[PDB]
Amino acid sequence: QQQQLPAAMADTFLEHLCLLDIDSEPVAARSTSIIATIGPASRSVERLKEMIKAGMNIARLNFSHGSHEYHAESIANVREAVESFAGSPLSYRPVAIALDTKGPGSGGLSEQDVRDLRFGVEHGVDIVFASFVRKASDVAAVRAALGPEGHGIKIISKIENHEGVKRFDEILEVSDGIMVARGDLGIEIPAEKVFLAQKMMIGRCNLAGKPVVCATQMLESMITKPRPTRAETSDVANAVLDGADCIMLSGETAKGNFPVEAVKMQHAIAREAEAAVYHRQLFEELRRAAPLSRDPTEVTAIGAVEAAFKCCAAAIIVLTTTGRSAQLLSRYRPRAAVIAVTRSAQAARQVHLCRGVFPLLYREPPEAIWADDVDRRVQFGIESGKLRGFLRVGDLVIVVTGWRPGSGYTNIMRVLSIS
Amino acid sequence: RADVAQLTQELGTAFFQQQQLPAAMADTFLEHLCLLDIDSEPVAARSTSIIATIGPASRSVERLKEMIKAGMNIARLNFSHGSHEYHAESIANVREAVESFAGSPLSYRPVAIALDTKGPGSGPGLSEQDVRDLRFGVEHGVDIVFASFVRKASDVAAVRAALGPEGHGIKIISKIENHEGVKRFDEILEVSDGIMVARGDLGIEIPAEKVFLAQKMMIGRCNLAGKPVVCATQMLESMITKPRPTRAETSDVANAVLDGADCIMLSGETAKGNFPVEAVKMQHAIAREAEAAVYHRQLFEELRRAAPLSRDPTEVTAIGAVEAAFKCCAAAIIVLTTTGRSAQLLSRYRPRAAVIAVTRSAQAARQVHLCRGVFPLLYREPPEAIWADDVDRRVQFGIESGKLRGFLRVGDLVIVVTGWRPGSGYTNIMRVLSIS
Amino acid sequence: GTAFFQQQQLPAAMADTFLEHLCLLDIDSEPVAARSTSIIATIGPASRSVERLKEMIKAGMNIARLNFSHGSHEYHAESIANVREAVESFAGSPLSYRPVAIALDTKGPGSGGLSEQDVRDLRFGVEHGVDIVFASFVRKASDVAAVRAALGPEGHGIKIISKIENHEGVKRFDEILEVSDGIMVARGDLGIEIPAEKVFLAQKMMIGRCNLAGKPVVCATQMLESMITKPRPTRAETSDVANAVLDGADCIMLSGETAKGNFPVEAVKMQHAIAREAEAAVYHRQLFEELRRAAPLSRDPTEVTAIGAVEAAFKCCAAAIIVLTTTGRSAQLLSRYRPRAAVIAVTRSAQAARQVHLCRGVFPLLYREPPEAIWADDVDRRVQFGIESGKLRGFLRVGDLVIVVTGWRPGSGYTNIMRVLSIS
Amino acid sequence: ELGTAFFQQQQLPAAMADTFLEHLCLLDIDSEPVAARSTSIIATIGPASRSVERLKEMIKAGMNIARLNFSHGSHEYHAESIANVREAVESFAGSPLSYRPVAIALDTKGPPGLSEQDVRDLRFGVEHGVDIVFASFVRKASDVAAVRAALGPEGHGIKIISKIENHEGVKRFDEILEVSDGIMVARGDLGIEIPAEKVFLAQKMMIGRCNLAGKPVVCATQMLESMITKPRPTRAETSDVANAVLDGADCIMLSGETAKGNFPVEAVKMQHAIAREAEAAVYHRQLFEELRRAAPLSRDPTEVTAIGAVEAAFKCCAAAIIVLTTTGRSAQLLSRYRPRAAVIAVTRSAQAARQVHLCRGVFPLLYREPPEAIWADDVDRRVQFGIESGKLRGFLRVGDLVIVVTGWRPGSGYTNIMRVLSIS
Ligand SMILES: O=C(O)CCCCNS(=O)(=O)c1cc2c(c(O)c1O)C(=O)c1ccccc1C2=O
């Protein structure tokens, strides 16, 4: 069998490793999102179209470099490249825009960060990667600088030093997610300890059900070379096996000679590594650790993921306003793709932070009866799923919906046979 | 602690001290045993059905009303004794006692009628007396047949043929009573609706010290197959003459439930003994304590690991509903069912939540007592013009009956299992509902 | 051979889940190992004859219980003399001699604190060299201290097994177990003191906690009750015996079945037959894993050697673990890990040989030879005595692997060596 | 006792976790490694690392195995490198605290069958007393047989580590491992022969299968590649080293990093620092459980003793397992169960002392005292030599517990004894 299914059926983690097969081809869509830093080498609309086709899901703009005018032009070019595919709604791929802050430097929230965060709100950025977060009050300051109009921007705290690692729990509690910012972390703490901080933070984020990004020097040699080193491919695969929701490219896409090839390489490795995940142990441990809950979205999500594993469901189609119902499905790490049908263009972009969530932006005419409108949003997930290769006639899918309109009312799971 | 901290704050520490919940949260079976607490009171409705043999001591309509209130779910008529006239009178008395509670549809308790055959004796196949008794069963509308001395698949085919075209809906529970039945167990279970571990004959046919191995193996295989299994004979034997059982008898009843038995049975204890109602009350009291002591964490994990992948939407919905019920400590899983099958597939995963099965079939309401944790509710209203409205009314009937009987309280979460179109075989929906 | 792997429920032993283990239990898979759960038989008019006691020893009785709720001191002194005469009638064949413990079961406090009758009975016990006290109605740690004080300076070596018979004993279980040598789940009184339908919860909890503590636990009362008057037990009775062994009980007991009934020998034979079947049905894969996980780290060399020896025995399907012991402690530490291999304990202490019957899977052998001049030769002779005893009794055959547990110097407390030996 | 500080070091809070997810969540950058680094470092000797003075610094930095790549250089060039390694190694014979055996490994050029150059280079290896051959491009069992035949009458004791470098070697892995002493995951060629994104699958599979077989596995190529020109590695490189150790690799390797790079000593220091951190982060609770479950039952006393000793070491947090070995086999069987305790292997064979560096966690001590007339005294002298070396090196202190593994008679193949000692 394909997608490492012989290794998936193993009774121990050791036997699972023994059964990994280089000839077992991945079939599932690539789950781990790729964040590519946009810079001189990846700014043109033509280059950005190739990066989107190669697998870029989130465009990062590093406000440690360039200027407001430079980054606004990169943002406009990203949006032009993304919207060039909107003419085919069944295959359109949303792409998030993330602003990475310069940071506090010596000393709270710097004056440059206040201005850059305001720029982010004015330019409709989806995510903020907040540099050098070392305590909960740093997150509150970033949130306050985003103001009343930036209530919906996701804050991903970058852990870059010893204090951030030690105060991790309080930082994660108030953040939307975390970035393991290994460049500074590898200079702030001994280089030989970074893997411990990475594995601990990824594990704690997986436990919390919040997105975690692995970043910096993942494919470093590809800045000048067309192929990566053996350590670099291993690093990408191990970040996925660790449980990372996203993987990142910095100089590799911002200034390197092979930006598209770096994205293609992360896509190819992530897909292989996702199939090599030992779901039998991972699901059991995530399910045991996820606390008991009376929230119906929480209850429906675990029921849906259990049902998907029982029938080898090709996908879990979920309707979501904010992305939350898709995020609660993603936290259980289903092998089934989570196809999230949303009308919110911002939620479609932001949900790339959660592993295995494939956002579909709904642009079909509304139905007069709310129940019919729900059914056509589900048929839209099915038709997009068929076109993209997620679904085929005869497949089983799990459909997750709610009892009334508006966010917070997901409570239904259905088993549906395709076509 | 972190996996139950928020729910402990919401439901309270008292909730998590009842129904052996501290033992339920243990990380190992050894720790689970260490945490069993005699002060942790059972809260859930008793899920293992009680089969009471009806005879001289339990025949009157007045006595039968007391036995139904004490917990009898299935009335057994042993065709090894009495006659057709005697058993028909017992059946009429059971039906009169059962129907005396029909005036209140929101509290009515269905009771199944089971015919236990005399058996083949020294003959190789279906005896002439069994052919006549099986025909009596069909004519008197019995729900279940406990077929004596089943030794191979062809024995069950002969019982099925003797029930004729009008008895296709009767459940056949094969009684394993000898070495051959144990050795050919897999082929017998494949063609039967369920099994009875008939320990009286089994304990004479094989060494007495080996019966527990056969009992535990057959219960385990039935649990794996998702088919009902009954533990029978001498469970509370001393209660035929004494008001209280022995220490070995209470232990035996508790261990049959912990083994995984769907039903427990009383023979002479209810048929001829001096304390028929007290014997039913004792099995009810022990079964509730034992059900709470089941280590669901390992049982659910092992039932998932051993059960193969399934493309049947009823099976897929059932596992998702049981998983959802455990996540929120659901008070109940309400399921709509025509034949009982959707309730049976929920029961095979052994949820702690009561499975409230709403059905229009009076026979399916009686037969689902064979499946552990299924509480049948007979819906008597005529169909609504719009099918979706009819479905909704049946779910609301389950909620209202649940509140009236004490299964459900305001603020509870319930899991509701329904299908996408009318008719049997289309269950595919699981909903999480808050009781208001 | 392939036949080896079909016996003693070995197909069920290899299962990956407890559910599949149950599914693989086979009534045709015959038990091979020696019966490891000890049988306690209460002595009375049905079992007091010296000749009848010889039959009970041959049937499998390991511990004779004297119930001091019935009979005078004169009655119990005669019981002790009769038991000792029957036991010593087999001493002429040292390779097959079976030690038998004598346990004094107290009348209890009644309406009162240690009663004055219990003080007198406990002093009688010390004067007559009883090995174990089954202390009735233990409700708290101070009840155990009072029993220990009544045994005096000469009774320090007597084991105290606290009987849990009421709600207070169950609630104060942890403090009682801490100061006791072991526990008895005294189901007769327990089933009247608490609701009858709750006794199984108290039994399973106390057995589980004693298994975790590595201390002996006895399941008692009405196990084969109908055999007081009938030749065969009920289906519930055989199930109760099998389930007490599967629960983890070190010992099972007979009261009226051996003291006053018409089938004392048959009741012992029935418990022996059931216990042997149930021991093979134990899912050692999960049990060993959980006993290891729950047991804390230890710096005591006897315990460290014991876990290593039990792990080694499982690795090679060892026929036995032969251990030399002065007090029984090295054998008890092996027993707490529940090896499938029989623990053959060789000792010179007649009292330790009798007391180790409290620990499941310990087969005591009383060595009577005076010490060799060279200590290493004395140890070897005792190990060879264990091997010769085991071959004669059917525990061992040529070609079997055994684990041998000894210490680095004479005297108690110095066990620290485990060795893999081929039987020649 | 041990103290609270003891339980905060070497990732012991993460070690006690009940799940792998909880284990990851408990990894702590402030929990310092205490145990000696157990993953051997292989350094390729070339232009940048040839001088006797540079080799002394590489030995102090942690190099355990010197690799001579016969794809380059010549017989004269590599003989001079080997003589320089031996001079640097023997310069530490004046201090037991710094003297460490260093293996010499010959890596072949590679291949219709065995190339003429490989026949001559393998002959050079035998003539120069090499310990190990890393055989390039092994694709099937007959490739190993050809290398084994070329090692001739004098070199049958040389270990053959088959390098898996292409699709065929991965597909025929089981047959290759069966006849090889171990494996090298040769990622350079493997990453060109198969898609680059699949190398991690082949690495993890081969390491897992070698761990199951109890045979050494090496992770190789581009582990710290950027350190050829830079003083510090990339974040991907440190992660790659840590993950090779967490995967289960017995050895990690440096090629161009030490052969031609500007920072050979720093590359060795970096691998030592990472390996030590990664070894403490291994989740032994699951690893030991799975190695035990997957390993078949065994009647070999060395195998039975090894699992018992590793279980005993975990029970007491033993500072070390001291094993007497002539071939290295008894130490290899301890290593296969991945104890946290260091395996201190005392041997009179200088070749076995160098070769046991292939097995994770084995610390070789070459013993050179003349044999005692009384064999038990010769065994005791070697056990005490292991203890006194352990004390001098920082492995052991007075009051520590150690597990000691020996056999019942002299000669290889008789290991059957495990003892718990207490350091005095
Ligand atoms: O901080 C350190 O020491 C670590 C290295 C950080 C850099 N990583 S990056 O992918 O964000 C990046 C971002 C940028 C550039 C990079 O070359 C680069 O590698 C530019 O040349 C550029 C030039 C004009 C305007 C904007 C940019 C720009 O945004």
Ligand SMILES: O=C(O)CCCCNS(=O)(=O)c1cc2c(c(O)c1O)C(=O)c1ccccc1C2=O
């Ligand atoms: O693509 C390939 O097949 C080649 C990849 C490089 C191989 N790596 S190595 O660490 O074994 C190594 C080995 C050597 C050298 C290396 O520079 C080098 O990186 C030399 O300059 C040298 C020069 C004179 C005599 C001997 C050597 C020598 O032994």
Ligand SMILES: O=P(O)(O)OC[C@H]1O[C@](O)(COP(=O)(O)O)[C@@H](O)[C@@H]1O
């Ligand atoms: O994931 P979220 O943000 O809670 O959104 C889920 C919501 O989407 C729905 O499925 C559809 O709601 P809308 O019709 O308002 O889009 C609701 O029933 C449910 O509450």
Ligand SMILES: O=P(O)(O)OC[C@H]1O[C@](O)(COP(=O)(O)O)[C@@H](O)[C@@H]1O
């Ligand atoms: O358990 P069964 O026998 O499959 O019955 C379940 C059936 O009951 C329903 O929920 C309701 O069906 P009806 O309206 O025919 O009673 C169906 O949608 C479903 O297929």
Ligand SMILES: O=P(O)(O)OC[C@H]1O[C@](O)(COP(=O)(O)O)[C@@H](O)[C@@H]1O
């Ligand atoms: O189990 P215990 O009471 O600690 O006895 C074990 C003792 O028995 C021995 O094996 C033999 O000791 P003796 O020669 O004194 O009988 C000692 O080495 C060891 O300390």
Ligand SMILES: O=P(O)(O)OC[C@H]1O[C@](O)(COP(=O)(O)O)[C@@H](O)[C@@H]1O
């Ligand atoms: O690991 P190996 O090569 O089998 O060597 C183990 C041998 O070492 C010993 O412990 C000591 O033997 P020697 O005295 O011959 O060195 C033997 O008892 C044992 O058989």
Ligand SMILES: O=C([O-])C(=O)[O-]
């Ligand atoms: O800021 C970052 O991305 C880093 O330091 O790795």
Ligand SMILES: O=C([O-])C(=O)[O-]
């Ligand atoms: O038939 C029965 O019920 C039996 O034998 O137990």
Ligand SMILES: O=C([O-])C(=O)[O-]
């Ligand atoms: O004392 C006892 O043995 C009892 O009450 O069971």
Ligand SMILES: O=C([O-])C(=O)[O-]
């Ligand atoms: O030969 C090697 O070492 C390689 O290819 O990695």
Ligand SMILES: [K+]
């Ligand atoms: K930045």
Ligand SMILES: [K+]
């Ligand atoms: K009958």
Ligand SMILES: [K+]
């Ligand atoms: K008494």
Ligand SMILES: [K+]
């Ligand atoms: K080479």
Ligand SMILES: [Mg+2]
């Ligand atoms: Mg940074």
Ligand SMILES: [Mg+2]
């Ligand atoms: Mg019968």
Ligand SMILES: [Mg+2]
């Ligand atoms: Mg009593």
